Design a protein around this nucleic acid. Sequence first.
RNA 1: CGAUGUCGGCUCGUCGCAUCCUGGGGCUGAAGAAGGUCCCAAGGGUUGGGCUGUUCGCCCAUUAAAGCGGCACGCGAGCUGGGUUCAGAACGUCGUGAGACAGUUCGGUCUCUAUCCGCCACGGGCGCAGGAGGCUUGAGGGGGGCUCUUCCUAGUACGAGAGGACCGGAAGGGACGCACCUCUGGUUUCCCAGCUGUCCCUCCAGGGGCAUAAGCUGGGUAGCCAUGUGCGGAAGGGAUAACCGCUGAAAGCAUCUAAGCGGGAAGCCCGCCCCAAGAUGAGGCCUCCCACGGCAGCCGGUAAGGACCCGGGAAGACCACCCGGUGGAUGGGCCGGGGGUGUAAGCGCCGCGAGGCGUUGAGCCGACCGGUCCCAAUCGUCCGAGGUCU
RNA 2: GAAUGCCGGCAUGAGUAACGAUAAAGAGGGUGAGAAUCCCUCUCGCCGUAAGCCCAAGGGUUCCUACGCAAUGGUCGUCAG
RNA 3: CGUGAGGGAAAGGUGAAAAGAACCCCGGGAGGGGAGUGAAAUAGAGCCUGAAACCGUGGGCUUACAAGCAGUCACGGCCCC
Lengths: 204, 118, 131, 122, 10, 59
Amino acid sequence: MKGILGVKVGMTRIFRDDRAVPVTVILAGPCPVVQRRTPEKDGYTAVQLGFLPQNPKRVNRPLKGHFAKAGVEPVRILREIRDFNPEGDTVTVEIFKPGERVDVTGTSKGRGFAGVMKRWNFAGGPDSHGAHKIHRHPGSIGNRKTPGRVYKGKKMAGHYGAERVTVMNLEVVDVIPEENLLLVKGAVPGPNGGLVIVRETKKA
Amino acid sequence: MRHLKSGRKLNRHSSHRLALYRNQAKSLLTHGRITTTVPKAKELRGFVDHLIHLAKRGDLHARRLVLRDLQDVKLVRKLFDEIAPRYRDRQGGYTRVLKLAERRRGDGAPLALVELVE
Amino acid sequence: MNRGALIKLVESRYVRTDLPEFRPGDTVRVSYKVKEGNRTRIQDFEGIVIRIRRNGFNTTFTVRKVSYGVGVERIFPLHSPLIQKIDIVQRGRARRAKLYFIRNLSDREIRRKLRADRKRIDQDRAAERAA
Amino acid sequence: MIQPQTYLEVADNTGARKIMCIRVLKGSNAKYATVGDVIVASVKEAIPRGAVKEGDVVKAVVVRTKKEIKRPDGSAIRFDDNAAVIINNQLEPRGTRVFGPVARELREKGFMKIVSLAPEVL
Amino acid sequence: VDKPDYRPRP
Amino acid sequence: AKHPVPKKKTSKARRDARRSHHALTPPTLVPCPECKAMKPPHTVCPECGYYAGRKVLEV
RNA sequence: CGAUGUCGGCUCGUCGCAUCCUGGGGCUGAAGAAGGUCCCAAGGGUUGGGCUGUUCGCCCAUUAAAGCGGCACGCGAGCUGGGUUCAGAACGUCGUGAGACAGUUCGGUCUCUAUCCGCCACGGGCGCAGGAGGCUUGAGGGGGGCUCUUCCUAGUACGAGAGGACCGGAAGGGACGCACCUCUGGUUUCCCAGCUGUCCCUCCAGGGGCAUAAGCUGGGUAGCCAUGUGCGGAAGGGAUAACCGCUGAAAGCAUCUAAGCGGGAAGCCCGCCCCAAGAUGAGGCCUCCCACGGCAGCCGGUAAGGACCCGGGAAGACCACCCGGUGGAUGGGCCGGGGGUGUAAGCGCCGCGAGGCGUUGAGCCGACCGGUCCCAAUCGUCCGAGGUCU
RNA sequence: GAAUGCCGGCAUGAGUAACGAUAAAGAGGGUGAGAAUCCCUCUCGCCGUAAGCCCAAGGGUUCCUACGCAAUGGUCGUCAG
RNA sequence: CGUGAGGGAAAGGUGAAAAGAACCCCGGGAGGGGAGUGAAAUAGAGCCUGAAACCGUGGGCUUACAAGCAGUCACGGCCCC
Ligand SMILES: [Mg+2]
Ligand SMILES: [Mg+2]
Ligand SMILES: [Mg+2]
Ligand SMILES: [Mg+2]
Ligand SMILES: [Mg+2]
Ligand SMILES: [Mg+2]
Ligand SMILES: [Mg+2]
Ligand SMILES: [Mg+2]
Ligand SMILES: [Mg+2]
Ligand SMILES: [Mg+2]
Ligand SMILES: [Mg+2]
Ligand SMILES: [Mg+2]
Ligand SMILES: [Mg+2]
Ligand SMILES: [Mg+2]
Ligand SMILES: [Mg+2]
Ligand SMILES: [Mg+2]
Ligand SMILES: [Mg+2]
Ligand SMILES: [Mg+2]
Ligand SMILES: [Mg+2]
Ligand SMILES: [Mg+2]
Ligand SMILES: [Mg+2]
Ligand SMILES: [Mg+2]
Ligand SMILES: [Mg+2]
Ligand SMILES: [Mg+2]
Ligand SMILES: [Mg+2]
Ligand SMILES: [Mg+2]
Ligand SMILES: [Mg+2]
Ligand SMILES: [Mg+2]
Ligand SMILES: [Mg+2]
Ligand SMILES: [Mg+2]
Ligand SMILES: [Mg+2]
Ligand SMILES: [Mg+2]
Ligand SMILES: [Mg+2]
Ligand SMILES: [Mg+2]
Ligand SMILES: [Mg+2]
Ligand SMILES: [Mg+2]
Ligand SMILES: [Mg+2]
Ligand SMILES: [Mg+2]
Ligand SMILES: [Mg+2]
Ligand SMILES: [Mg+2]
Ligand SMILES: [Mg+2]
Ligand SMILES: [Mg+2]
Ligand SMILES: [Mg+2]
Ligand SMILES: [Mg+2]
Ligand SMILES: [Mg+2]
Ligand SMILES: [Mg+2]
Ligand SMILES: [Mg+2]
Ligand SMILES: [Mg+2]
Ligand SMILES: [Mg+2]
Ligand SMILES: [Mg+2]
Ligand SMILES: [Mg+2]
Ligand SMILES: [Mg+2]
Ligand SMILES: [Mg+2]
Ligand SMILES: [Mg+2]
Ligand SMILES: [Mg+2]
Ligand SMILES: [Mg+2]
Ligand SMILES: [Mg+2]
Ligand SMILES: [Mg+2]
Ligand SMILES: [Mg+2]
Ligand SMILES: [Mg+2]
Ligand SMILES: [Mg+2]
Ligand SMILES: [Mg+2]
Ligand SMILES: [Mg+2]
Ligand SMILES: [Mg+2]
Ligand SMILES: [Mg+2]
Ligand SMILES: [Mg+2]
Ligand SMILES: [Mg+2]
Ligand SMILES: [Mg+2]
Ligand SMILES: [Mg+2]
Ligand SMILES: [Mg+2]
Ligand SMILES: [Mg+2]
Ligand SMILES: [Mg+2]
Ligand SMILES: [Mg+2]
Ligand SMILES: [Mg+2]
Ligand SMILES: [Mg+2]
Ligand SMILES: [Mg+2]
Ligand SMILES: [Mg+2]
Ligand SMILES: [Mg+2]
Ligand SMILES: [Mg+2]
Ligand SMILES: [Mg+2]
Ligand SMILES: [Mg+2]
Ligand SMILES: [Mg+2]
Ligand SMILES: [Mg+2]
Ligand SMILES: [Mg+2]
Ligand SMILES: [Mg+2]
Ligand SMILES: [Mg+2]
Ligand SMILES: [Mg+2]
Ligand SMILES: [Mg+2]
Ligand SMILES: [Mg+2]
Ligand SMILES: [Mg+2]
Ligand SMILES: [Mg+2]
Ligand SMILES: [Mg+2]
Ligand SMILES: [Mg+2]
Ligand SMILES: [Mg+2]
Ligand SMILES: [Mg+2]
Ligand SMILES: [Mg+2]
Ligand SMILES: [Mg+2]
Ligand SMILES: [Mg+2]
Ligand SMILES: [Mg+2]
Ligand SMILES: [Mg+2]
Ligand SMILES: [Mg+2]
Ligand SMILES: [Mg+2]
Ligand SMILES: [Mg+2]
Ligand SMILES: [Mg+2]
Ligand SMILES: [Mg+2]
Ligand SMILES: [Mg+2]
Ligand SMILES: [Mg+2]
Ligand SMILES: [Mg+2]
Ligand SMILES: [Mg+2]
Ligand SMILES: [Mg+2]
Ligand SMILES: [Mg+2]
Ligand SMILES: [Mg+2]
Ligand SMILES: [Mg+2]
Ligand SMILES: [Mg+2]
Ligand SMILES: [Mg+2]
Ligand SMILES: [Mg+2]
Ligand SMILES: [Mg+2]
Ligand SMILES: [Mg+2]
Ligand SMILES: [Mg+2]
Ligand SMILES: [Mg+2]
Ligand SMILES: [Mg+2]
Ligand SMILES: [Mg+2]
Ligand SMILES: [Mg+2]
Ligand SMILES: [Mg+2]
Ligand SMILES: [Mg+2]
Ligand SMILES: [Mg+2]
Ligand SMILES: [Mg+2]
Ligand SMILES: [Mg+2]
Ligand SMILES: [Mg+2]
Ligand SMILES: [Mg+2]
Ligand SMILES: [Mg+2]
Ligand SMILES: [Mg+2]
Ligand SMILES: [Mg+2]
Ligand SMILES: [Mg+2]
Ligand SMILES: [Mg+2]
Ligand SMILES: [Mg+2]
Ligand SMILES: [Mg+2]
Ligand SMILES: [Mg+2]
Ligand SMILES: [Mg+2]
Ligand SMILES: [Mg+2]
Ligand SMILES: [Mg+2]
Ligand SMILES: [Mg+2]
Ligand SMILES: [Mg+2]
Ligand SMILES: [Mg+2]
Ligand SMILES: [Mg+2]
Ligand SMILES: [Mg+2]
Ligand SMILES: [Mg+2]
Ligand SMILES: [Mg+2]
Ligand SMILES: [Mg+2]
Ligand SMILES: [Mg+2]
Ligand SMILES: [Mg+2]
Ligand SMILES: [Mg+2]
Ligand SMILES: [Mg+2]
Ligand SMILES: [Mg+2]
Ligand SMILES: [Mg+2]
Ligand SMILES: [Mg+2]
Ligand SMILES: [Mg+2]
Ligand SMILES: [Mg+2]
Ligand SMILES: [Mg+2]
Ligand SMILES: [Mg+2]
Ligand SMILES: [Mg+2]
Ligand SMILES: [Mg+2]
Ligand SMILES: [Mg+2]
Ligand SMILES: [Mg+2]
Ligand SMILES: [Mg+2]
Ligand SMILES: [Mg+2]
Ligand SMILES: [Mg+2]
Ligand SMILES: [Mg+2]
Ligand SMILES: [Mg+2]
Ligand SMILES: [Mg+2]
Ligand SMILES: [Mg+2]
Ligand SMILES: [Mg+2]
Ligand SMILES: [Mg+2]
Ligand SMILES: [Mg+2]
Ligand SMILES: [Mg+2]
Ligand SMILES: [Mg+2]
Ligand SMILES: [Mg+2]
Ligand SMILES: [Mg+2]
Ligand SMILES: [Mg+2]
Ligand SMILES: [Mg+2]
Ligand SMILES: [Mg+2]
Ligand SMILES: [Mg+2]
Ligand SMILES: [Mg+2]
Ligand SMILES: [Mg+2]
Ligand SMILES: [Mg+2]
Ligand SMILES: [Mg+2]
Ligand SMILES: [Mg+2]
Ligand SMILES: [Mg+2]
Ligand SMILES: [Mg+2]
Ligand SMILES: [Mg+2]
Ligand SMILES: [Mg+2]
Ligand SMILES: [Mg+2]
Ligand SMILES: [Mg+2]
Ligand SMILES: [Mg+2]
Ligand SMILES: [Mg+2]
Ligand SMILES: [Mg+2]
Ligand SMILES: [Mg+2]
Ligand SMILES: [Mg+2]
Ligand SMILES: [Mg+2]
Ligand SMILES: [Mg+2]
Ligand SMILES: [Mg+2]
Ligand SMILES: [Mg+2]
Ligand SMILES: [Mg+2]
Ligand SMILES: [Zn+2]
């Protein structure tokens, strides 16, 4: 159940057997394991990974202790991968070979307060024929006296994006260990520069 | 959304905003220091910096470009002969913006001074 | 890190430098590997290039030709391995980067708007004088 | 991107000149036909005494389109019109020549008879 | 089912 | 629309509960290191005209 | 009846199951394929069009299918206003008439501001017996749940023939969903060019305003995007429905059942994805501070830490979140690259001239990828444990 | 204690909608207890078969100057019908 | 208010006496704080009395796992006499 932290760098395509392959490039290596969570100690199993080096000037004292106890130089992000336990004290892109399928988790781009047409692909209202100031409105939200209320979960306008999203079963197109690059075919949540997690896929 | 868009709108349509900057340039290049609202000051920096840099180039081309925004032939001449020279060896950052402590009475707008640098 | 540099890095393995420079307006023949049955062959597509979108490794260019009465436009990645070669067959002088306006012009009218780019022709012949 | 109401030129000699799509035969509820797809169509304009006549409801395979088709090799091709060749229930042209180029896509979709009769395949 | 307005328009 | 309108007068308890967030926060002020007069941080001092160690403006 | 707005449509759903399809099954006057009929099944799905105000219905073209009902004949403080109920007008018809009709016809005022509950989002407060910075478990909840075609098996089983399988295995689609922006394709209010009229600068040349809240036109980076790209529905495990059994009495036979055991659905539980400890039942782990002064309490100064303030941000209505604050690349400038435009001005040459050619892929040049302390994030302030009892 | 009573006062909605044409503003100087809002200058924009000028109705001192800013001005006011 | 005929309000009270607050202080002023007057100044002219709704400051008790025609009965806690 291997996994790794990384940053989305950007997309392009490569050519592979006279085929254009759209890819997102992820900087993944190298992630120092900084804690192991164990069934005896913690009740479950996983690896806290760290990623990108941090200026010690900016690391407070409780954090420093945590890093110290690992003999690990301070790092900007800590995140766990569950049910993964690497033999090394460091995880790098090498844990993936081209051909493998992965799941990538990102924080999606933020749309802010979104209307119903962008959030939920509502149809909105006519643009003419008499529609009166309701071209992007949701329409009805209910019945009448029965039930006299609006369902929990009713799709409505509101904040949208900047959310955890995990896209699944992406092909690993290539891995360039010398530069800590993982090339995954397709699209990955969030902006370039955003933090992502690459896991072995759960599909078969 | 506004994702990675550069530029204030300052509640002006296109042609008014442009005039706002030019008139502010003429004023700043004229007096060396002016006061405005903080955000107007923050946009003036770049607008004027480019005109000063162009003045540092000195060519005829540069003058004719500067004259699109600034229009006053004497003013440009001051820019070219008096202003640009003091920045021959300065690399950008010919303007500075410092925030004033007192808000404006009639509308509470925060003020800042914008000035050409030494 | 430098994200731009890393993309350029991923891309460097696929970049080409063996292809001639050309501009919108030039007439060009692209010999393109093409798959059919059971073989692959080279098909030539020859026409005016009406667009070149630039984006480094991802720049693409569009070639327009008339084929048995019907206009056809083809869009090619400039760095595509499927391009065998490109031959410059004529240099045209455009005044515009994008030449969509010729989609509505007659063959006479096109020829009048895209006269031979006598400068870049001369320039072409002056190379092609080798050692 | 052919859809019901779309007029297509007919690129054969069935005598039909113009057909208007009335359905895309690609599943239960397809929004668009592209190259290699079969539509059902009305004949809106034909020449006198052909195989087909104005009013006929016929099938046709779309053979070139004004919306560009993209290809796995990263390229795309685009034609100046939307054209279809009229076929019978076994995908064979009801006509005997096909005019103008056609999209190679037809071949992988088993329109060999049409692909071969075509002056050009792009 | 068409049935008649029981109220007039406002 | 059909002109909505409050169905009951708001009780004093309710009105005042709504204002539970209405308190002003006092201006954040720091001493001016040249003249010791209180002022907003990041502003040229209006008392003495100093900022960043130097005399910025006539006061 | 001191008003419970009334048909149809749109929008948005949600439920029932007497199921239209898809899954499971018994019987068949079930050879096969296809059907009929009943049973189980509500997870998902259930198309586009012509007519008509229509609901309905008929019709065209498709489909796995084109289900039927409830929700104030769901939904007018959500839209419409074609239909019916006002005043005008006309036809038919009735009435001497004024006028009339569970007839027809053309026309005809649909109300910016949401208090409470409810719903979508976001915070502020307090709590979670020391105070803090991280990382987490998942009670519980939500999301999802569709399906077709072709090929192989095999032209095999079956069948006189036409036709044509079970099981198992491949490939390719439609619609839907989430994400994305490399490509394709949009936009890109000033990023570039061209162009007209007019006024102006400065006469020429070169420019500026205005013609829209871009004057017009040709283009167009980032961004945000779909028409573009990737991926999803599963697999799998468990328990079941109808239905099929094994073993088996009562009842020497028989019996799926009374004891016991098995098989068995798109359905159910788990599995996937997302929320989630206000889960007051307030969880856990790692790290940091410490037992300070005066009188489970008050007042004061601190600790770890936090906030304030500032520069900002693919975060954002405010708030929040995230990054940075000279021990600095946070924005602005400047430089380099990209990218757009498409060869500036000036000068020289040719031409009577409009123009042309060269200098020149020039000049200009948003946002992208970077560098660089030139400009600004100066200087600081205020909060903040001393840990209740068996 | 009620008559959608009468008269008056004061609440609620609420620091909410709004502040009356999307022709448009910016800076420097002056004045003053106080200035986005008054004066002056420069720059910018709008009208120009008018949004300029002259008559008649109607209005009735609103004209000019000095001194004022409680109220009137949808904000401010040192300004003003 | 209405073209007009015509309609048609609200609005009383310092104190015995103005003795109606000189002068100083803050403030542009308004306003207040002292001083002074008066038997009395929360009789200070926005003046006798000065109710109630309504707005506030300060104190006691109470309240952030709770379900409400708001009370009532009971017990307990805290605060006061
Ligand atoms: Mg993340
Ligand atoms: Mg956003
Ligand atoms: Mg909407
Ligand atoms: Mg959406
Ligand atoms: Mg959409
Ligand atoms: Mg729609
Ligand atoms: Mg629409
Ligand atoms: Mg419509
Ligand atoms: Mg209307
Ligand atoms: Mg509208
Ligand atoms: Mg209703
Ligand atoms: Mg109810
Ligand atoms: Mg958010
Ligand atoms: Mg490879
Ligand atoms: Mg991005
Ligand atoms: Mg917008
Ligand atoms: Mg940016
Ligand atoms: Mg902006
Ligand atoms: Mg701008
Ligand atoms: Mg403005
Ligand atoms: Mg505004
Ligand atoms: Mg604008
Ligand atoms: Mg303008
Ligand atoms: Mg304009
Ligand atoms: Mg710049
Ligand atoms: Mg400052
Ligand atoms: Mg401030
Ligand atoms: Mg003021
Ligand atoms: Mg890039
Ligand atoms: Mg060929
Ligand atoms: Mg006919
Ligand atoms: Mg309404
Ligand atoms: Mg409303
Ligand atoms: Mg309305
Ligand atoms: Mg509303
Ligand atoms: Mg209202
Ligand atoms: Mg009400
Ligand atoms: Mg009240
Ligand atoms: Mg109160
Ligand atoms: Mg309230
Ligand atoms: Mg009634
Ligand atoms: Mg009532
Ligand atoms: Mg009513
Ligand atoms: Mg009602
Ligand atoms: Mg009605
Ligand atoms: Mg329904
Ligand atoms: Mg049933
Ligand atoms: Mg079935
Ligand atoms: Mg059968
Ligand atoms: Mg049979
Ligand atoms: Mg059956
Ligand atoms: Mg169902
Ligand atoms: Mg359901
Ligand atoms: Mg249903
Ligand atoms: Mg029609
Ligand atoms: Mg219809
Ligand atoms: Mg109908
Ligand atoms: Mg009917
Ligand atoms: Mg079927
Ligand atoms: Mg239908
Ligand atoms: Mg009914
Ligand atoms: Mg109804
Ligand atoms: Mg209904
Ligand atoms: Mg209704
Ligand atoms: Mg309505
Ligand atoms: Mg209705
Ligand atoms: Mg309603
Ligand atoms: Mg209503
Ligand atoms: Mg209602
Ligand atoms: Mg609506
Ligand atoms: Mg009608
Ligand atoms: Mg009718
Ligand atoms: Mg009528
Ligand atoms: Mg009528
Ligand atoms: Mg009539
Ligand atoms: Mg008659
Ligand atoms: Mg009758
Ligand atoms: Mg009669
Ligand atoms: Mg009669
Ligand atoms: Mg009409
Ligand atoms: Mg009518
Ligand atoms: Mg009507
Ligand atoms: Mg309306
Ligand atoms: Mg409310
Ligand atoms: Mg309620
Ligand atoms: Mg909270
Ligand atoms: Mg909070
Ligand atoms: Mg645990
Ligand atoms: Mg759970
Ligand atoms: Mg709960
Ligand atoms: Mg076979
Ligand atoms: Mg046989
Ligand atoms: Mg599939
Ligand atoms: Mg791009
Ligand atoms: Mg694009
Ligand atoms: Mg592209
Ligand atoms: Mg494009
Ligand atoms: Mg420009
Ligand atoms: Mg312009
Ligand atoms: Mg001009
Ligand atoms: Mg000229
Ligand atoms: Mg002008
Ligand atoms: Mg004008
Ligand atoms: Mg204008
Ligand atoms: Mg126009
Ligand atoms: Mg034009
Ligand atoms: Mg375009
Ligand atoms: Mg444009
Ligand atoms: Mg773009
Ligand atoms: Mg799409
Ligand atoms: Mg299963
Ligand atoms: Mg048996
Ligand atoms: Mg037995
Ligand atoms: Mg027996
Ligand atoms: Mg049993
Ligand atoms: Mg069983
Ligand atoms: Mg069995
Ligand atoms: Mg089982
Ligand atoms: Mg399934
Ligand atoms: Mg979580
Ligand atoms: Mg907790
Ligand atoms: Mg948690
Ligand atoms: Mg509970
Ligand atoms: Mg906890
Ligand atoms: Mg901030
Ligand atoms: Mg911000
Ligand atoms: Mg910080
Ligand atoms: Mg600091
Ligand atoms: Mg920086
Ligand atoms: Mg920089
Ligand atoms: Mg470049
Ligand atoms: Mg370039
Ligand atoms: Mg040239
Ligand atoms: Mg030149
Ligand atoms: Mg000459
Ligand atoms: Mg550049
Ligand atoms: Mg450095
Ligand atoms: Mg300080
Ligand atoms: Mg009574
Ligand atoms: Mg009332
Ligand atoms: Mg009332
Ligand atoms: Mg009353
Ligand atoms: Mg009363
Ligand atoms: Mg009354
Ligand atoms: Mg009253
Ligand atoms: Mg009030
Ligand atoms: Mg507010
Ligand atoms: Mg409100
Ligand atoms: Mg509001
Ligand atoms: Mg409001
Ligand atoms: Mg109003
Ligand atoms: Mg407002
Ligand atoms: Mg106004
Ligand atoms: Mg206004
Ligand atoms: Mg307008
Ligand atoms: Mg001044
Ligand atoms: Mg003022
Ligand atoms: Mg003032
Ligand atoms: Mg001023
Ligand atoms: Mg103004
Ligand atoms: Mg003035
Ligand atoms: Mg005009
Ligand atoms: Mg004129
Ligand atoms: Mg008068
Ligand atoms: Mg007077
Ligand atoms: Mg006079
Ligand atoms: Mg006067
Ligand atoms: Mg006057
Ligand atoms: Mg005066
Ligand atoms: Mg006044
Ligand atoms: Mg005043
Ligand atoms: Mg005043
Ligand atoms: Mg007075
Ligand atoms: Mg007033
Ligand atoms: Mg006022
Ligand atoms: Mg007013
Ligand atoms: Mg004065
Ligand atoms: Mg006045
Ligand atoms: Mg009257
Ligand atoms: Mg009168
Ligand atoms: Mg009267
Ligand atoms: Mg009275
Ligand atoms: Mg008296
Ligand atoms: Mg008296
Ligand atoms: Mg005095
Ligand atoms: Mg004074
Ligand atoms: Mg006084
Ligand atoms: Mg006082
Ligand atoms: Mg006094
Ligand atoms: Mg006395
Ligand atoms: Mg006495
Ligand atoms: Mg008293
Ligand atoms: Mg008294
Ligand atoms: Mg009184
Ligand atoms: Mg008395
Ligand atoms: Mg009294
Ligand atoms: Mg009183
Ligand atoms: Mg009282
Ligand atoms: Mg109190
Ligand atoms: Mg509880
Ligand atoms: Mg409690
Ligand atoms: Mg009780
Ligand atoms: Mg008791
Ligand atoms: Zn100071």
